[PDB]
Symmetry: C2
Subunit: 122 residues, 2 copies
């Protein structure tokens, strides 16, 4: 679901999902358009496309389980749906972790207006 993704975000970025990544740029937010701002903002783009590939599943609601080995998310527990959703969340979270340097705090609460131009094909 989005809960495990949130916990993943906290575990990988050491920053809470809100407000750091739920109101960011043009895609890191409930429904996004336009081109993505920075590298972090694009991670959410890839996350959406990833979710979009899983039409056979319910990425936002279907809860899953995940564990760690050498400090890396495994997420290999249940259904292929859950597995792939977990995979998307893992990719997005790691992408957040790898772009802490590029991360701009000014892009928090980046308005839907000035977010131009709608949109970008996956």
């Amino acid at each position: 679901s989005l809960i495990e993704f949130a916990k993943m975000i906290l575990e990988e970025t050491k920053r809470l999902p809100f407000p750091y990544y739920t109101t960011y740029g043009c895609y890191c937010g409930w429904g996004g358009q336009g081109q993505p701002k920075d590298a972090t903002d694009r991670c959410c783009f890839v996350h959406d496309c990833c979710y979009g590939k899983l039409s056979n599943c319910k990425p936002k609601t279907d809860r899953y389980s995940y564990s760690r080995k050498s400090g890396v998310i495994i997420c290999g527990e249940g259904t292929p749906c859950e597995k792939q959703i977990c995979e998307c969340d893992k990719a997005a979270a790691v992408c957040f972790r790898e772009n802490l340097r590029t991360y701009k705090k000014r892009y928090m609460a980046y308005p839907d207006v000035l977010c131009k131009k709608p949109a970008e094909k996956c």
Copy 2:
């Protein structure tokens, strides 16, 4: 800022702000576009009205400190903004906690067209 408020939400409701409250109801989850359908949904309304009484403060971005006595949030000293913003966030988080008995997980990502637009005046 919303960072401190997020940490307050996590500390008081024992749940991450996202997705439990960022996406809740018609006011919390839809940028205050709709009428609150819950007590905890109304908490966001009162919180937002608290930000309204404050100017020219920047509640979203301006940081502040807060301690914890016997289970109670203690706002730090400084600019009047930093204190009153903290009081808004505190009142809001405490409000979230006190209405955990009313909290409905099913109100997460509530349908937009089911929301009554707009909300009331503060």
